[PDB]
Amino acid sequence: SKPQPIAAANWKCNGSESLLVPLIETLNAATFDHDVQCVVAPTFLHIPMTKARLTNPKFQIAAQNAITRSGAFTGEVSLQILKDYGISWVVLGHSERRLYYGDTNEIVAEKVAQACAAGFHVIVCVGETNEEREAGRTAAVVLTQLAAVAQKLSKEAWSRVVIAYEPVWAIGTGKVATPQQAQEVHELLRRWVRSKLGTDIAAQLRILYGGSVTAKNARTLYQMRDINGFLVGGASLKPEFVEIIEATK
């Protein structure tokens, strides 16, 4: 009675034809016998090679970011450019962009509203830092990030929204997340969605875990009642990613 899981690969700022081609070919060979939406997010530069070569029908290609409009924005890629290319999924609000690249709550919320308006599926990332977690602000922070996005969306747009929780407090700090800690946050995120949008939207919403996911820990994470799959970092650049997809059975 979980909704359809998602196994998503965030390749981040990594890649080359030598690295990615064998990886894509492996995914093409992978068969799953369960209903799962798979997603790969290459850098913008590798999207064309990935679209040309990825043949597995259970996969969609996503961008790792987008801006809201085409125009005089040197360096950036807009949603409209992506849509014209045939890309219909996008990751928005990733912790790395919130930290280093100017993704404020308001900027993320506007990107999400426009992506949804243009027909995109969106993986919206939320997560608290170590200072925030230790101040006891975990719930407040992730719900503030979520509410900013939610305020702009009509009910129907939620069918194309996916949330990813990133335990930012666990990167480089000495801290390490457990599945039960992830479950606690996934659960409070869903309860807020339930309170705002109703039981059906909450039950069908995919909330993916975006902390460190490996073939070693994926099965135990997916066992948690409110975890609907993964936004995977480093392991998604490796053949072990196939086993991670398998753990969403």
Add this chain to the structure above:
Amino acid sequence: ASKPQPIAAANWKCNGSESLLVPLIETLNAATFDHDVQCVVAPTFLHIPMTKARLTNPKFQIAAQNAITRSGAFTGEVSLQILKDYGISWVVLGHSERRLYYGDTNEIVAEKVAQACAAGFHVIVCVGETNEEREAGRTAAVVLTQLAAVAQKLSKEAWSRVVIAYEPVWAIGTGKVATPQQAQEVHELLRRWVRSKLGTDIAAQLRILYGGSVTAKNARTLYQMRDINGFLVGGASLKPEFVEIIEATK
């Protein structure tokens, strides 16, 4: 001294689709100009693969519109190393739009340029002052502050692969209309500073491109200026008339 090899560079900014860009690429493949000029086209990252495959005019190099200094956990960004591996060897850095909206501070631009030069890139380094800065009498102050941040991280040898583009931000989307004479004023002060810091040879060889409003109407008026070595072109580079702009560097 005599001008070095001119550059005509197209900055497509955040624009493009197969229907828009293919006609432009084929217009350039069909162009007949044969003088010594380095042409550059800077597509979005998404359109770099198509452009590389389709653009066969050997007078062109493809550039990225931005890059970061290293691969890694930088979701949404493209690194110099990823571009180098793809066969891209030109990059635009410090564009006014990035300085204004996308966090390109003077120091961040300087580190990007230093890394780019070390990775074998030719770099179009953008500088320029706003309307407020010009009114305050800070034209020279602002462009030399931006350029000096970059220069502090460069070896003398790196300069062979450096190109400067002056953007009169004060005249872009404002009621102000920059004249070729005002452009020449800034290009001259830039070259004077380079000459004083690095010597006659580096200054003589350096390309300083004008990155204000360049059209097929005004391109020759600008190239006639002594210290203007070509263009970084915005809107007009999304039109067939960019061919006439290249012809203006004769």
